[PDB]
Amino acid sequence: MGPGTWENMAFAQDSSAINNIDGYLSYTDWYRPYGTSQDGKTWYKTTAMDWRPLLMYIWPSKDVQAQFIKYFVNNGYENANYGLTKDTVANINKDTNTTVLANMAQNLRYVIEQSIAANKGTSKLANDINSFAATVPELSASSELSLQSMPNYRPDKSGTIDSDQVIFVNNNSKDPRKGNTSYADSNYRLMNRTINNQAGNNNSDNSPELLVGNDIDNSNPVVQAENLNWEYFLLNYGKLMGYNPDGNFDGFRVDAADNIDADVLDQMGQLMNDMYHTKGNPQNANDHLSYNEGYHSGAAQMLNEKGNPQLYMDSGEFYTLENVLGRANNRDNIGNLITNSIVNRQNDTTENEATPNWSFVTNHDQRKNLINRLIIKDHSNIPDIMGSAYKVEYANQAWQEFYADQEKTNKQYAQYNVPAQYAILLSNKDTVPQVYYGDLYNETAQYMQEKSIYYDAITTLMRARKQFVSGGQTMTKLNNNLLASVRYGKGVVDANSNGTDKLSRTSGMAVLVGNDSNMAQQSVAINMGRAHANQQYRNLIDTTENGLTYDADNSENPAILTTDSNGILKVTVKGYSNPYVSGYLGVWVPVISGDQDVTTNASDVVANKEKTFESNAALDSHMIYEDFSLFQPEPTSVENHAYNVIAKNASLFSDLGITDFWMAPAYTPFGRSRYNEGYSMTDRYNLGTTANPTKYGSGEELANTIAALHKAGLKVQEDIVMNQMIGFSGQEAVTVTRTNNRGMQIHVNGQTYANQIYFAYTTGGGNGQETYGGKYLAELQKNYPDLFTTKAISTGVAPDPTVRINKWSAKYQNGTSLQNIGIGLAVKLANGDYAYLNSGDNKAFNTLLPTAIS
Ligand SMILES: OC[C@H]1O[C@H](OC[C@H]2O[C@H](O[C@H]3[C@H](O)[C@@H](O)[C@@H](O[C@H]4[C@H](O)[C@@H](O)[C@@H](O[C@H]5[C@H](O)[C@@H](O)[C@@H](O)O[C@@H]5CO)O[C@@H]4CO)O[C@@H]3CO)[C@H](O)[C@@H](O)[C@@H]2O)[C@H](O)[C@@H](O)[C@@H]1O
Ligand SMILES: OC[C@H]1O[C@@H](O)[C@H](O)[C@@H](O)[C@@H]1O
Ligand SMILES: [Ca+2]
């Protein structure tokens, strides 16, 4: 033919001239037409570099075509000579005649080609297309139907939106109206097999499958084998990388244990017993301490029934501590500290009975909830403030407000009675307590550079624990708002024991806590036990008008008091109100001359063939340290990499009685993630290089840090994160449905969608996954064949080591939180059929394209 409008056709019907996603077309993608023109008269053939946006040629409707013409004429593509002025376009809409819309669009393409010529490139055009697309609901975030759009929405302090999800469903249809994404089909995706619902027949926990990100299908037997690979890797990190050969993790902090198929918890425990013989061997179990993060109390029962392969997280204790001691007003009664925990501590005088557990005053997420509350307070009328309208400047403002408020007596945001919360935590029996980095240090400064105001109080309590805390526990109300928590000492079982250990006489502790700042002054009697008659006690911590004293300076009691002939200690107390105490805090320990360490060895406790973890004096001797904050800043030098600062201070952590060091998730972070902390990772096996460190440092540094912690006598756990990955660079065409956090379809303001092609980011994993994914499966099968013959509960089948995961894609994923791309990107023709490019491996339908690009 002669030259003309037919040159709008695609240069060729394949991937060399039409971008596509598994054969489907996206309205925001570009294509190479055969030719282009600036006036409709002279037409120029296209080089391989001359690509154009599809939104110049096709649209999902007449409405959107009219908006496009309108928008471009109002943003630099006005030309009176081609019938395109602000006046000529002001009234056009979906009901404008078809032939004049097509004419206006053709003339606009000429006007656009003139702009491309003038600007010597498509750079401005590309920005104008992106700016236009953001104003069209079906081509942008709002059509995904966020809960944030609801009238008078209240943002959630968690900073995630639980019900903003989509599931990936099967679709092997031959109907072009439904499309086909069969490469992403699965025989698994068993969702919500969480905690006691592992077998699908007890949802008394109602714990959700979905949190945030791309949710991994931990019911897929190939995925379950890959988790064993990943565990084995981390447990031998340093020697498998050729880095420090003692730079190997000893165990795991298990992220999101309530939100993944519980099979993986059974399987992790099995692996670690195969490798280290933990079951029935407290010394081996305790050397490989592992503990599960969760806020559902039903996990205690689950873990007991399983023989306790990991520690239960006692969140009840945290909420009790905050409700009793931490509020400004409407404090719960002091007695709740006795009863409202997974362990009742009224008179706790036995061992191997309580649910093995870990407890805390603060963790990284709880500090975040406070900071996000503050952000929401500071910037009301911004409903999506916790989603896409979040700005780091709001966090900075909140942190400045927090540090100021933390120093006040009348705190508006920060917790009251932080020292007393710790005094209870670190004296409690039948728990492994967990101290938070950000309660010892100002967590937004460079790593460990600024001590927190609570550093002195908490570190005093930490050292005394190692020296003194052992034996039975009794907690007793002395009045309606004040309590004494007493430990009787190593080898002292209860208040009536004489003591059976050489350290019995000189160990034990009394912690006095009240939560009424107006409490009248009075005397109180504390029962130290029969092993502690006529004995001198030191005033470790007492309260003063302005704070705490560590040497009985200007407090109600002197530096030493002595018990009577029955073991009763007599003490004076009253209510105070200062930045450290709202109520009262007192701590008493026996006076001693030298060093003392009351740790009980695991070789000396009762072994039980059916238990891994047992709550006894040996396990109680452990203390966990959370080494990070979400708001930890990017380092300013190699010397300030957390890993190097940590290695340098190894002896400090040992001196504070820390036995188990919880290291942040060390994985390569998604660069655009909110915090760059490691839970939003793109590569599960790359833990940073010298050229490209993570927030915390390089892999080589990590291995040296672990070795240095081992040299100081500590064991080290890695935060293992099976639930989600975030930041995949590869898009895939998936078939999806709008759901809540359990994968059940919902409506949002009366609207919904189901079985729709969505161009989600799903594919990636980095070179770490390529190299290390499944690498160790052959050897694990050779050494521990039972791992791949034991039928898992949720599926009834063993993990499958015959397939290696070198690259993640949707077939291994349950779904995703909303990705802010739009549900209408997928090109449909007028009749509703999906457009499709039959090329290469994409054979699902015959090539079918819009008529505008022939
Ligand atoms: O073209 C731009 C960009 O596009 C792609 O990336 C899109 C990305 O979308 C999805 O991930 C986003 C997610 O859906 C959002 O909810 C949001 O996640 C936030 C949380 O909202 C936030 O609270 C926090 O989460 C942490 C918790 O607070 C904490 O308690 C603990 O549990 O750790 C959590 C994990 O960090 O931070 C996350 C992360 O910011 O933002 C997400 C994206 O930032 C989808 O899952 C991703 O796979 C998609 O990549 C391209 O990938 C990208 O290359 C391109 O530049
Ligand atoms: O942004 C669209 C881009 O698509 C690529 O496939 C082309 O090679 C680029 O020249 C073009 O600009
Ligand atoms: Ca999950």
PDB file of N, CA and C in Angstrom, residues 306-333:
ATOM      1  N   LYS A 306       2.777 -30.663  71.115  1.00  0.00           N
ATOM      2  CA  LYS A 306       3.912 -31.035  70.252  1.00  0.00           C
ATOM      3  C   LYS A 306       5.231 -31.313  70.988  1.00  0.00           C
ATOM      4  N   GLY A 307       5.234 -31.282  72.317  1.00  0.00           N
ATOM      5  CA  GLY A 307       6.455 -31.466  73.084  1.00  0.00           C
ATOM      6  C   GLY A 307       7.384 -30.265  73.120  1.00  0.00           C
ATOM      7  N   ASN A 308       6.835 -29.088  72.811  1.00  0.00           N
ATOM      8  CA  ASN A 308       7.513 -27.799  72.913  1.00  0.00           C
ATOM      9  C   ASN A 308       8.796 -27.691  72.068  1.00  0.00           C
ATOM     10  N   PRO A 309       8.661 -27.759  70.729  1.00  0.00           N
ATOM     11  CA  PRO A 309       9.817 -27.600  69.845  1.00  0.00           C
ATOM     12  C   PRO A 309      10.358 -26.167  69.755  1.00  0.00           C
ATOM     13  N   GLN A 310       9.527 -25.182  70.095  1.00  0.00           N
ATOM     14  CA  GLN A 310       9.951 -23.784  70.247  1.00  0.00           C
ATOM     15  C   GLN A 310       9.276 -23.169  71.488  1.00  0.00           C
ATOM     16  N   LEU A 311       9.794 -22.041  71.975  1.00  0.00           N
ATOM     17  CA  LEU A 311       9.125 -21.303  73.069  1.00  0.00           C
ATOM     18  C   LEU A 311       7.867 -20.567  72.589  1.00  0.00           C
ATOM     19  N   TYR A 312       6.859 -20.573  73.442  1.00  0.00           N
ATOM     20  CA  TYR A 312       5.645 -19.804  73.249  1.00  0.00           C
ATOM     21  C   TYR A 312       5.903 -18.336  73.631  1.00  0.00           C
ATOM     22  N   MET A 313       5.426 -17.381  72.826  1.00  0.00           N
ATOM     23  CA  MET A 313       5.552 -15.954  73.201  1.00  0.00           C
ATOM     24  C   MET A 313       4.410 -15.512  74.123  1.00  0.00           C
ATOM     25  N   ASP A 314       4.742 -15.219  75.383  1.00  0.00           N
ATOM     26  CA  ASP A 314       3.749 -14.792  76.402  1.00  0.00           C
ATOM     27  C   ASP A 314       3.323 -13.333  76.235  1.00  0.00           C
ATOM     28  N   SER A 315       2.530 -13.053  75.208  1.00  0.00           N
ATOM     29  CA  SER A 315       2.055 -11.674  74.970  1.00  0.00           C
ATOM     30  C   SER A 315       1.126 -11.163  76.052  1.00  0.00           C
ATOM     31  N   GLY A 316       0.391 -12.064  76.698  1.00  0.00           N
ATOM     32  CA  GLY A 316      -0.505 -11.689  77.812  1.00  0.00           C
ATOM     33  C   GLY A 316       0.216 -10.876  78.876  1.00  0.00           C
ATOM     34  N   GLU A 317       1.444 -11.298  79.202  1.00  0.00           N
ATOM     35  CA  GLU A 317       2.331 -10.600  80.155  1.00  0.00           C
ATOM     36  C   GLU A 317       2.642  -9.173  79.711  1.00  0.00           C
ATOM     37  N   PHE A 318       2.954  -8.998  78.432  1.00  0.00           N
ATOM     38  CA  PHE A 318       3.209  -7.664  77.908  1.00  0.00           C
ATOM     39  C   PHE A 318       1.985  -6.752  78.101  1.00  0.00           C
ATOM     40  N   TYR A 319       0.798  -7.219  77.714  1.00  0.00           N
ATOM     41  CA  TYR A 319      -0.419  -6.391  77.822  1.00  0.00           C
ATOM     42  C   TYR A 319      -0.760  -6.112  79.291  1.00  0.00           C
ATOM     43  N   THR A 320      -0.573  -7.110  80.149  1.00  0.00           N
ATOM     44  CA  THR A 320      -0.759  -6.951  81.591  1.00  0.00           C
ATOM     45  C   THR A 320       0.189  -5.864  82.140  1.00  0.00           C
ATOM     46  N   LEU A 321       1.465  -5.945  81.783  1.00  0.00           N
ATOM     47  CA  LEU A 321       2.447  -4.943  82.222  1.00  0.00           C
ATOM     48  C   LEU A 321       2.039  -3.528  81.787  1.00  0.00           C
ATOM     49  N   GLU A 322       1.566  -3.393  80.547  1.00  0.00           N
ATOM     50  CA  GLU A 322       1.177  -2.081  80.018  1.00  0.00           C
ATOM     51  C   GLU A 322      -0.137  -1.569  80.632  1.00  0.00           C
ATOM     52  N   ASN A 323      -1.113  -2.456  80.799  1.00  0.00           N
ATOM     53  CA  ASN A 323      -2.393  -2.073  81.383  1.00  0.00           C
ATOM     54  C   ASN A 323      -2.283  -1.776  82.867  1.00  0.00           C
ATOM     55  N   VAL A 324      -1.381  -2.453  83.569  1.00  0.00           N
ATOM     56  CA  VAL A 324      -1.229  -2.267  85.031  1.00  0.00           C
ATOM     57  C   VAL A 324      -0.304  -1.104  85.382  1.00  0.00           C
ATOM     58  N   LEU A 325       0.859  -1.045  84.733  1.00  0.00           N
ATOM     59  CA  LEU A 325       1.908  -0.061  85.049  1.00  0.00           C
ATOM     60  C   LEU A 325       2.107   1.078  84.036  1.00  0.00           C
ATOM     61  N   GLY A 326       1.818   0.812  82.767  1.00  0.00           N
ATOM     62  CA  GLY A 326       2.187   1.718  81.675  1.00  0.00           C
ATOM     63  C   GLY A 326       1.253   2.857  81.309  1.00  0.00           C
ATOM     64  N   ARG A 327      -0.018   2.754  81.660  1.00  0.00           N
ATOM     65  CA  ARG A 327      -0.985   3.808  81.320  1.00  0.00           C
ATOM     66  C   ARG A 327      -0.836   5.037  82.224  1.00  0.00           C
ATOM     67  N   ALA A 328      -1.329   6.176  81.739  1.00  0.00           N
ATOM     68  CA  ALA A 328      -1.466   7.386  82.554  1.00  0.00           C
ATOM     69  C   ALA A 328      -2.590   7.210  83.558  1.00  0.00           C
ATOM     70  N   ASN A 329      -3.743   6.741  83.080  1.00  0.00           N
ATOM     71  CA  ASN A 329      -4.956   6.570  83.883  1.00  0.00           C
ATOM     72  C   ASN A 329      -5.619   5.221  83.606  1.00  0.00           C
ATOM     73  N   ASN A 330      -6.631   4.895  84.413  1.00  0.00           N
ATOM     74  CA  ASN A 330      -7.382   3.632  84.297  1.00  0.00           C
ATOM     75  C   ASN A 330      -6.430   2.433  84.242  1.00  0.00           C
ATOM     76  N   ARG A 331      -5.495   2.426  85.188  1.00  0.00           N
ATOM     77  CA  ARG A 331      -4.607   1.303  85.388  1.00  0.00           C
ATOM     78  C   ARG A 331      -5.389   0.117  85.945  1.00  0.00           C
ATOM     79  N   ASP A 332      -5.134  -1.079  85.415  1.00  0.00           N
ATOM     80  CA  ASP A 332      -5.673  -2.301  86.010  1.00  0.00           C
ATOM     81  C   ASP A 332      -4.972  -2.570  87.344  1.00  0.00           C
ATOM     82  N   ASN A 333      -5.584  -3.418  88.176  1.00  0.00           N
ATOM     83  CA  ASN A 333      -5.081  -3.661  89.542  1.00  0.00           C
ATOM     84  C   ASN A 333      -3.716  -4.346  89.509  1.00  0.00           C
TER      85      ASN A 333
END
